[PDB]
Design a protein around this ligand. Structure first.
Ligand SMILES: Nc1nc2c(ncn2[C@@H]2O[C@H](COP(=O)(O)OP(=O)(O)OP(=O)(O)O)[C@@H](O)[C@H]2O)c(=O)[nH]1
Ligand SMILES: [Mg+2]
Ligand SMILES: [Mg+2]
Ligand SMILES: [Mg+2]
Ligand SMILES: [Mg+2]
Ligand SMILES: [Mg+2]
Ligand SMILES: [Mg+2]
Ligand SMILES: [Mg+2]
Ligand SMILES: [Mg+2]
Ligand SMILES: [Mg+2]
Ligand SMILES: [Mg+2]
Ligand SMILES: [Mg+2]
Ligand SMILES: [Mg+2]
Ligand SMILES: [Mg+2]
Ligand SMILES: [Mg+2]
Ligand SMILES: [Mg+2]
Ligand SMILES: [Mg+2]
Ligand SMILES: [Mg+2]
Ligand SMILES: [Mg+2]
Ligand SMILES: [Mg+2]
Ligand SMILES: [Mg+2]
Lengths: 212, 511
RNA sequence: AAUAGGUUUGGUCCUAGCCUUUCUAUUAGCUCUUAGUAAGAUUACACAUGCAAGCAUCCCCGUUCCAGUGAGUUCACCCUCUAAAUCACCACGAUCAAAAGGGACAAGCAUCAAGCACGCAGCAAUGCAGCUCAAAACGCUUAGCCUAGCCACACCCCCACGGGAAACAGCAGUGAUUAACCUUUAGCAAUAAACGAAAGUUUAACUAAGCUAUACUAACCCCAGGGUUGGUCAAUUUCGUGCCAGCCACCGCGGUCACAC
RNA sequence: CCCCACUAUGCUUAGCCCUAAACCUCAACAGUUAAAUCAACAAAACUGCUCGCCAGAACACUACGAGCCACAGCUUAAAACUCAAA
RNA sequence: AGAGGAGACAAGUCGUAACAUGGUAAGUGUACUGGAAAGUGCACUUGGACGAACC
């Protein structure tokens, strides 16, 4: 019943782990893009069609941060997609920047900031996602006050919604069966269901990384 | 049994007839430039890329000058059937003669049998050739004959344009037309087994248009056309009349030269079954006769043959059947097949102590190791005459050694003595050596006035009471035989001889 | 083995083996009209060719799934503990389920009877000399299993850094091999999966087709073959054969009047 | 086979060998004669409990493996081919 | 691969070992001996008989 040990399996697993840790690719290697063919030479995968124009027009976050003192710590950065989708100020307040030293132009790396999406800031700074995207723009120092200027519109949102027909009927029948005679319509509380827009930035910390 | 056979369609209606390309077959003698001329026409070189520079296969190529279907027949005497098949399927025969040989005469006979026009190509350039052909019923236009003769130089590519012009003119005169619609009628040019594409047949379409999924029957075989390719391997979506095509999808490998007919659907099988039944009946009749002939009463070389194509196998089998030395050694054909040497061939050779001959086929390391383990001899050749020579060598090896008798000396008896030695009376012949010398080791024979009485070795050779091994000419010697029954007279003769074993070579000749 | 039957012998009784009768599956012979459905290489031997994994405003995610094979084989089930995953986010938990621990878990062979360290105590040093086994240890051979499905493998070296070498046990197909042999079809319209916020895109999964009497269902104005005919066991007239040719599942037949060829 | 002579041997001592138609071919223990007694013969038919053994004939008191002071041995002990019997 | 064994095939040859008291009753173990079944010694068995009052 005693399984014969499989030493080579563990040996190969450790060797693979060590090789991956030592030979891990850099951000510049991963996110390099051939603007003539719109492909990443690291893996030779074409970018999606809808991004093509952006790849040909906009710039990356580090592509802007590399031309600022201390790599732009404290500056405000926005995204073109946010500007085209939402009218309220959507941007990031930089708190830490880790550029990739292996990039000749130092136009790659990670960045951390406090997100202010549609006028609402976040209590803590966190890693900025979609840094490598050709979607970013820099808020001017003289325009920071004007751009961040936003009056919070009242949150005039609905509170409860009607139940689905069969569920409402079943709940009413259960009420009657248990003896309740209340005519109050069953309602579904949607206040706790905060509907974040699909372009709300996600937790870059939990996001994975491409393999080498 | 009801007749379910699929028969050739009746001759096409004149309205349905449509002009088609011509089928031209290049025939001639060994090394007369047929392959070189075809290479010049095809704009590609393949004569150089061959094993020994010998055409051992009949290949069909669609050349675009107009379009023609050129068939390269082998020039060797071995593949006679192959040449005949070309004559059977061709519309025009280009007879290539180097500046008349046996195979040229055979090709002329084949063309006469097929009733096909002949264009003479005097390669390596002529009047002597035409004058000789006058005897073989090939008359040139200079001699009032219909056959057009064109002197050409294939190596230098001279006068080939006029040769093509003459071919096109003859094709136009023939007015070759066929129905490009309806059930397909064609002929198999070759059949083989590709390890990736299965059983494949090189065929020529004679009537109708062949398409993927068409159900065909040829001999005892049938197919649902799976891939139609050309000489280059590229798939072709249609096969018009007078177009070579490699067809894949045969459930069984057809024999070369068998007609291919299209049928409505696979449940083809019935047709095949019927044909099989017919063959069985024929065999059964023969069997019955043989069986009745029995019932009224009441140095063995076994060869396996594995060839690349059925045509080459047929040629080798025809060569084998020309064996006439059965008395000295019996040549038994255990099994013949198409494809690389396989486990069944090795098992058959091991069972019958035979030898496998592989013509243009391979044998993997596993097969070779198995043959070595089982004592099987696989002999792979790429040239037919090399295989023939190897078979002749094996047959000669099977033959017993031939004893050569060389006379060494001759002695005439003079007197007969009776010597009492060991309580035994030994007759001793006093002999005088006349010509040559006598040796104890060499054998002797006794001659009585020309008759041969005894054959053997002396039990004791003694001269002047002394044993001497070799007695020179003129020396007296007393000779005693091991056989006491032999009687010695006054006028008997003795001839000494040396026997040497010599290698015996097979009397069979492949020609 | 049953509602049993034939067969030992000059005959009876008993014991006993063998075979018959029944139901499936595969292959072979002969034969075969159609429709629907189900099922479908012999082979862990080698593979030509075409396809089978993308999606998506770039990052990510997936390609670890589905699909396949049965080579190997008490990794499958129960309990304890608790990873990864889903419930947006903690769920101060639920579901699902790895590793680890305990238990249970195929067949034949004892002409496989000893294994040879297979145990315990101590924090450790180290000490004790034990542990399993005829209630089958140890070993050899065989085999996928306990089937809403599960286990194992993924060309071989159990593993796979590495080496051998260049991989269809994915689909269609082929070579070899075997008694054994499905199309080199179409579509993502349905469901499932992957991706996306989504319209949707992709999928040889799958769906809808193709071939095959392998099976079941149903029918046809016309269209029926195969086997058998001494007994078991339903059913033979006349010729020929002459212990020959031949037949038989068992008992047996055939030597000039054969219900058995 | 019958007659005569003699040896190993039969006997004693010390070790081995470990086999028999070693069979009363009828296992040990406890109990019954009630019946439905009971294939045949033999030495009547049975019940409870336990152990050992058996599963067509022949191959086969055999081969191989293993153990033994046994070395032409003893114990355990097969299989293949064959038959429709034994 | 030279050979040994078993079974079948079944001949011919040399005897007649077993089945009747099989003409020496048969057999077991064992030892020796023999062309062959087999013979003999020793002990054992009835899967033989001793005729079943006296005579
Ligand atoms: N002098 C001369 N030699 C030629 C000419 N054409 C061809 N040859 C040579 O003749 C030889 C012809 O033999 P092959 O090329 O094998 O053609 P073949 O006549 O079909 O011979 P097989 O294939 O064996 O039947 C070639 O090797 C050429 O070198 C020519 O026009 N002039
Ligand atoms: Mg040539
Ligand atoms: Mg298997
Ligand atoms: Mg044994
Ligand atoms: Mg297995
Ligand atoms: Mg494979
Ligand atoms: Mg592996
Ligand atoms: Mg496949
Ligand atoms: Mg095949
Ligand atoms: Mg089948
Ligand atoms: Mg989703
Ligand atoms: Mg005496
Ligand atoms: Mg005494
Ligand atoms: Mg006793
Ligand atoms: Mg004994
Ligand atoms: Mg023994
Ligand atoms: Mg032994
Ligand atoms: Mg007697
Ligand atoms: Mg006696
Ligand atoms: Mg006695
Ligand atoms: Mg004696």
């Amino acid at each position: 019943k005693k399984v014969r040990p499989r030493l080579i399996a563990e040996l190969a697993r450790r060797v693979r782990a060590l090789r991956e840790q030592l030979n891990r690719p850099r951000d510049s290697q991963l996110y390099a893009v051939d603007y003539e063919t719109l492909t990443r030479p690291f893996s030779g995968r074409r970018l999606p069609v809808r991004a093509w124009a952006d790849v040909r027009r906009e710039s990356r976050l580090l592509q802007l941060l590399g031309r600022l003192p201390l790599f732009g710590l404290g500056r405000l950065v926005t995204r073109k997609s946010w500007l085209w989708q939402h009218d309220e100020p959507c941007y990031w307040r930089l708190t830490r920047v880790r550029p990739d030293y292996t990039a000749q132009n130092l136009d790659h790396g990670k960045a951390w900031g406090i997100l202010t999406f549609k006028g609402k800031t976040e209590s803590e700074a966190r890693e900025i996602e979609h840094v490598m995207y050709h979607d970013w723009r820099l808020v001017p120092k003289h325009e920071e006050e004007a751009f961040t200027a936003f009056t919070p519109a009242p949150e005039d949102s609905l509170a409860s919604v009607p139940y689905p027909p069969l569920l409402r009927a079943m709940i009413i029948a259960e009420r009657q069966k248990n003896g309740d005679t209340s005519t109050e319509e069953p309602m579904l509380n949607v206040q706790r269901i905060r509907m974040e827009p699909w372009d709300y930035p996600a937790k870059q910390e939990d996001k994975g990384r491409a393999k080498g | 049994r009801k007749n379910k056979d699929a028969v050739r369609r009746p001759q096409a209606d004149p309205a349905l007839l449509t002009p088609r390309s011509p089928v031209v077959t290049i025939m001639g003698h060994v090394d007369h430039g047929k392959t070189t001329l075809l290479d010049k026409f095809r704009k590609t070189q393949v004569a150089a890329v061959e094993t020994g520079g010998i055409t051992q296969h009949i290949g069909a190529f669609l050349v675009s000058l107009e379009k023609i279907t050129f068939l390269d027949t082998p020039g060797h005497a071995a593949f006679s059937a192959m040449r005949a098949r070309g004559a059977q399927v061709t519309d025009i025969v280009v007879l290539v003669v180097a500046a008349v040989m046996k195979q040229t005469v055979e090709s002329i006979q084949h063309a006469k049998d097929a009733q096909v026009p002949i264009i003479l190509a005097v390669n390596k350039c002529p009047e002597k050739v035409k004058k000789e052909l006058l005897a073989y019923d090939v008359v040139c236009e200079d001699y009032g004959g219909d056959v057009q003769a064109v002197p050409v130089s294939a190596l230098t590519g001279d006068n080939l344009m006029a040769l093509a012009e003459a071919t096109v003119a003859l094709a136009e005169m023939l007015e070759l037309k066929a129905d490009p619609n309806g059930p397909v009628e064609g002929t198999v040019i070759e059949s083989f087994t590709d390890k990736g594409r299965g059983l494949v047949t090189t065929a020529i379409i004679q009537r109708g248009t062949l398409r993927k999924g068409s159900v065909l029957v040829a001999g005892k075989c049938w197919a649902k056309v799976r891939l139609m390719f050309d000489e280059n391997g590229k798939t072709i979506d249609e096969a018009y009349p007078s177009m070579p095509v490699g067809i894949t999808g045969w459930r069984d490998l057809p024999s070369a030269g068998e007609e291919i007919l299209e049928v409505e659907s696979e449940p083809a099988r019935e047709v095949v079954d019927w044909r099989k039944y017919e063959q069985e009946q024929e065999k059964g009749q023969e069997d019955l006769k043989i069986i009745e002939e029995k019932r009224k009463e009441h140095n063995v070389l076994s060869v396996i043959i594995k060839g690349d194509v059925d045509g080459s196998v047929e040629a080798i089998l025809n060569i084998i059947d020309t064996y006439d030395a059965s008395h000295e050694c019996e040549l038994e054909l255990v099994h013949f097949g198409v494809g690389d040497v396989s486990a069944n061939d090795v098992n058959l050779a091991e069972t019958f102590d035979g030898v496998i001959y592989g013509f243009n086929v391979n044998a993997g390391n596993v097969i070779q190791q198995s043959a070595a383990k089982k004592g099987v001899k696989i002999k792979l050749h790429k040239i037919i005459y090399r295989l023939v020579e190897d078979l002749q060598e094996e047959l000669s090896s099977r033959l017993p050694c031939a004893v050569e008798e060389h006379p060494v000396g001759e002695a005439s008896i003079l007197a007969t003595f009776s010597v009492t030695e060991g309580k035994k009376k030994v007759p001793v012949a006093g002999c005088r050596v006349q010509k040559g010398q006598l040796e104890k080791q060499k054998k002797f024979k006794l001659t009585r006035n020309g008759h041969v009485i005894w054959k053997g070795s002396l039990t004791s050779l003694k001269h002047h009471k002394d044993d001497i091994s070799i007695v020179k000419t003129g020396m007296d010697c007393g000779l005693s035989l091991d056989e006491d029954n032999m009687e010695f007279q006054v006028g008997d003769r003795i001839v000494c001889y040396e026997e040497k074993q010599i290698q015996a070579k097979t009397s069979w000749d492949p020609g």
